[PDB]
Amino acid sequence: EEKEILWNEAKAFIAACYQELGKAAEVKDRLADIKSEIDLTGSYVHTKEELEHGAKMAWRNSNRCIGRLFWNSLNVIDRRDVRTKEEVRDALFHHIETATNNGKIRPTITIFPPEEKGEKQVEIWNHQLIRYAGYESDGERIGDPASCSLTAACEELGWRGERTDFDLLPLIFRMKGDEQPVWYELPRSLVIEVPITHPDIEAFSDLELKWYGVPIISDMKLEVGGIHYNAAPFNGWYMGTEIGARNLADEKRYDKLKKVASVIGIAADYNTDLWKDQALVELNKAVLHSYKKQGVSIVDHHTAASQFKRFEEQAEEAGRKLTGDWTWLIPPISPAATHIFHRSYDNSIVKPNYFYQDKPYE
Amino acid sequence: EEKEILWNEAKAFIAACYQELGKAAEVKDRLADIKSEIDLTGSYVHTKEELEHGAKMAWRNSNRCIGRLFWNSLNVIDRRDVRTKEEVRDALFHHIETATNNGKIRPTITIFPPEEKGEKQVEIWNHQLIRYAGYESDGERIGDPASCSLTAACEELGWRGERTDFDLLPLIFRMKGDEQPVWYELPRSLVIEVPITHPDIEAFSDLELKWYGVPIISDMKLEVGGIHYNAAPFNGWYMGTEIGARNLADEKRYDKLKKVASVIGIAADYNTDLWKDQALVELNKAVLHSYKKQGVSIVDHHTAASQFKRFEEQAEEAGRKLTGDWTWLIPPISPAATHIFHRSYDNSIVKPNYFYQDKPYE
Ligand code: HEM
Ligand code: HEM
Ligand SMILES: NCc1cccc(OCc2ccc3ccc(N)nc3c2)c1
Ligand SMILES: NCc1cccc(OCc2ccc3ccc(N)nc3c2)c1
Ligand SMILES: C[C@H](O)[C@H](O)[C@H]1CNc2nc(N)[nH]c(=O)c2N1
Ligand SMILES: C[C@H](O)[C@H](O)[C@H]1CNc2nc(N)[nH]c(=O)c2N1
Ligand SMILES: [Cl-]
Ligand SMILES: [Cl-]
Numbered sequence A, B: 001e002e003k004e005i006l007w008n009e010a011k012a013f014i015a016a017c018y019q020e021l022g023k024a025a026e027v028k029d030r031l032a033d034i035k036s037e038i039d040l041t042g043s044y045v046h047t048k049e050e051l052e053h054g055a056k057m058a059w060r061n062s063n064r065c066i067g068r069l070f071w072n073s074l075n076v077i078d079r080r081d082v083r084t085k086e087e088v089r090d091a092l093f094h095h096i097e098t099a100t101n102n103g104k105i106r107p108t109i110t111i112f113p114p115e116e117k118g119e120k121q122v123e124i125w126n127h128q129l130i131r132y133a134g135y136e137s138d139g140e141r142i143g144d145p146a147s148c149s150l151t152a153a154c155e156e157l158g159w160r161g162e163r164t165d166f167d168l169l170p171l172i173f174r175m176k177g178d179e180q181p182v183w184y185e186l187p188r189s190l191v192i193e194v195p196i197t198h199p200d201i202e203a204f205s206d207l208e209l210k211w212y213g214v215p216i217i218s219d220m221k222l223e224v225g226g227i228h229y230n231a232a233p234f235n236g237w238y239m240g241t242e243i244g245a246r247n248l249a250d251e252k253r254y255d256k257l258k259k260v261a262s263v264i265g266i267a268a269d270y271n272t273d274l275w276k277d278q279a280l281v282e283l284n285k286a287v288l289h290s291y292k293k294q295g296v297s298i299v300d301h302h303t304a305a306s307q308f309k310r311f312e313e314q315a316e317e318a319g320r321k322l323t324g325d326w327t328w329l330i331p332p333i334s335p336a337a338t339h340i341f342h343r344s345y346d347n348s349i350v351k352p353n354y355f356y357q358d359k360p361y362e
Helices: A002-021 A023-040 A048-058 A066-075 A086-103 A145-156 A200-207 A240-247 A257-263 A274-293 A300-316 B002-018 B024-041 B048-060 B068-073 B083-102 B145-156 B202-207 B241-247 B257-263 B275-294 B300-318
Strands: A075-078 A108-111 A122-124 A134-137 A140-143 A172-174 A183-184 A191-197 A210-212 A220-225 A227-229 A353-354 B077-078 B108-111 B122-125 B135-136 B140-145 B171-175 B182-184 B193-195 B208-214 B221-224 B227-229 B354-355
Touching: A002 A023, A048 A108, A048 A220, A048 A353, A075 A086, A075 B257, A075 B300, A086 A108, A086 A274, A140 A145, A183 B024, A191 A274, A200 A257, A200 B135, A240 A274, A240 B182, A257 A274, A353 B108, B002 B024, B002 B048, B048 B068, B048 B077, B048 B108, B068 B145, B068 B300, B083 B108, B083 B171, B083 B202, B135 B145, B140 B145, B145 B171, B145 B241, B193 B275, B221 B257, B241 B275, B241 B354, B257 B275
Parallel strands: A075 A108, B077 B108
Antiparallel strands: A122 A172, A134 A140, A172 A183, A191 A210, A220 A227, A220 A353, B122 B171, B135 B140, B171 B182, B193 B208, B221 B227, B221 B354
16 A cells, blocks of 8 residues: 555656656666565665656655755765764764764765655754754743753753853654654864854944854754655755844744844834834845955855755756745845745655654653 | 625625624514515615624625724714715715815715616716826936826826826816816815835935825725625825835835835845845835824834734634635734734635726726
8 A cells, every 4th residue: 555655656766856857767767666666665775866856856755944055065975874873973974074064064964864764764853953052941941942841851861051142952763663762962163153253333342142154953854756865954055044033042942132133222112113123134234244344154144045046947947846835935134135035836746755753751 | 686686795794794783573574674665676775883893794794804903893874875976985085085185084975876787876986086197208217106097087087287296187077977087286275295214214204105095995896785885985094114115215215125125224235234124114104103202103013013913813703714815814014923923814705895897998
């Protein structure tokens, strides 16, 4: 029965993949071999070329991503050979180092063995490989609230955070056959962080804000031709509003706008003064400035939207339908200053793609 | 056949209306009379109470409107008695005066006779009763581009604009039986305008920007219980971002951000400087400041979203489903600083409601 779903997804994927790669003649024979492999084994294994192109197609089809112009230059690392937790840890360390690339961030994905019978071989608990811990106990709030439940689960496993506002969570993942995940502290030499300063306002450093250099999303499932790679962490570089308009600004995140207003010298007393807006713009200028000054890749939302316009143009020229999720593509500051705001997008789901999956804690 | 649609919409509307008004006992008899009136005449006439409550329900059900907390205090003017173009003009003048209310804007709707056999009795051509003209001819762009086609149609009818950037369009409407609409210049004594100045930056007045005090949308159809009031202009007060983030900022509108940047003393050369964002915030501060200084009602988007949160709470308490269009409810600056951004809304269409209708020019 699932052989049916699998074979169907296989046909659809191999045909499209090989057509894009100029390999249309090889489809019939490759499909023959896949049909046999499924019958005999219940599954099939992707060639290196298929897996690479599949992961790139999945980024290309990610409706919520403004950064897709660069889909074809994704660096794909095939780690389907891993079997041990040391190998997994070392692969994850390696991904941090190679994606970071001394600041000149390389979009990269590391792909681990896929689910077999719906059974995961490796289950990554982190939301991102680099993320700060969060704590809330009797009135006291420290760190990133979005990390509270994962932080608590880590401290059930014997990890203990220093309870600064920026503790790095350890890597945490579980291997097939193990009842419990294992965790490993990140080597600080691998993790670039950027202090936030402002180009003109010297007091801005008084806020003692910082953020990490590379967002490496590690909790999504990559699905390609019916094969489910539940562990396949990937990264790009940040768009500054993710940090300045959301991570540092949201009330349920670091909630810094009132402190930003004070250091930039404006009152935070009257809605009509638009002090939240002014604070957001200055915080976002600081974030871009800081990353650039330190030589860590970042894109501003205007440049990102201009790149996305080229992605829409390239889709049309290639004769591919564009899909998109307008509610995620607009940036959270000045969205109507981008072309995205002024058009609509078909939010159809096309595979290969990246998918949410249930948390293993919570 | 349309008697079917009409009678059905009638039943649904009268039942809900009378239930909200405490008049549930009177429904059966009122429906009896409506059934007879439809049979004999092809239509039915709303009581003053029904029409008033229907227009209020239509605002309440307007998914794209952030300003609905105040739905029940809509001032409804019943002008179903008008038969002549002088009466229509005078009603429209009266609406401007009474809605404006010397700056303390009263949300108001004036309701004209409804469509009979799908035949309009009065057809209003204006998008808003007060709006600026726009011109584009051989390279030359003047005024509001969104008004170009209506401006051209007016100049086909013998009107001539002064070709300032802020010419007031005349009222223009057509009566049943007339082949052509008529137009009337607005008396300038009726039209409040606000010069845009900034609270701290004195050079801002050099841009010589202004805007009109009251948005009076005059091209939508109000539908209540199956009766179609295609001419029923209504107004609220502005939310400052409509003026500062869209009318004065959009590239296809007045396109002022580059000029704003220059007068506030910042470079407009690098996307990473976020100069468009900074210019937007200062333009929006100026707009709020200017309206307030002149005593003309306006709301900022933070206060408006806080009022909308109370509207959602009141809907729940009343046991009414909330409907909303997230893409229109978020403001165009700092949307993630509002609660609206962080939730979702059911965009179902519920009647009574306001609806688009085809332009009679174009
Ligand atoms: C190269 C730089 C990149 C930039 C600047 C970028 C930008 C973004 C942004 C701003 C978001 C919205 C995030 C949020 O609001 O929470 C996003 C979503 C997304 N991006 Fe990209 N992206 C990049 C690369 C990548 C890569 C390499 C992949 C995968 C190979 C990817 C897949 C996605 C996906 C799946 C989402 C949606 C996540 C969800 O539904 O929660 N992006 N991207
Ligand atoms: C009292 C102050 C009011 C405020 C501050 C307000 C605010 C707004 C805003 C900001 C929009 C979005 C406009 C755009 O993006 O083009 C809007 C849409 C709307 N408002 Fe309100 N509004 C108010 C009163 C009213 C009244 C009195 C009515 C009708 C009785 C109304 C009906 C609507 C409708 C129908 C739309 C959607 C128009 C469309 O689909 O194009 N509003 N409102
Ligand atoms: N549980 C899945 C889940 C929940 C929330 C966010 C998310 O990913 C957001 C995301 C994904 C990929 C990105 C790539 C680059 C970038 N700058 N931001 C990015 C942000 C994934
Ligand atoms: N052709 C229908 C059409 C097209 C575009 C906009 C519109 O109305 C926008 C609108 C409607 C009512 C409003 C009431 C108050 C306000 N501040 N803005 C408001 C804005 C109506
Ligand atoms: C078609 C596209 O979604 C369009 O730009 C919408 C989006 N959101 C909006 N929101 C508001 N309040 N007003 C608008 O005119 C628009 N335009
Ligand atoms: C559910 C609700 O639409 C939610 O706030 C979405 C809206 N738009 C977004 N857009 C982006 N880029 N990122 C987000 O996290 C969200 N949140
Ligand atoms: Cl993030
Ligand atoms: Cl307007």
